[PDB]
């Protein structure tokens, strides 16, 4: 019947799916922290929510691929891909 009951907030999500989602992120964080680099936490960069069902689920699509990035972050991404 193609019924997926997994549509739920992350607080009540399963531990297995949460670990599956978190494992690549944790691995990436460990890889970038092993080398050792400065971390920027500027307050002017708080752009988490700037772009324009059950339990108030209202998804949206964000197209942020047009933002140009620095060469240092490009090299870091290349190293992560390698």
């Amino acid at each position: 019947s193609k019924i997926q009951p997994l549509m739920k907030p992350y607080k009540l999500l399963s531990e297995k799916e949460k670990e599956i989602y978190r494992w690549p992120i944790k691995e990436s964080l460990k890889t970038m922290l092993a080398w050792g680099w400065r971390i920027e936490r500027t307050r002017e960069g708080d752009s988490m929510a700037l772009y324009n069902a059950a339990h108030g689920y209202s998804p949206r699509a964000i197209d942020m691929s047009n933002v140009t990035l620095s060469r240092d972050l490009h090299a870091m991404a290349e190293m992560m891909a390698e």
């Binding site: 680099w37 920027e40 240092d72 972050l73």
Partner: peptide, 11 residues
């Protein structure tokens, strides 16, 4: 993933 929240890795 890295652009959000202003997280920039620098040497």
């Amino acid at each position: 993933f890295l652009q959000i929240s202003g997280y920039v890795v620098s040497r």
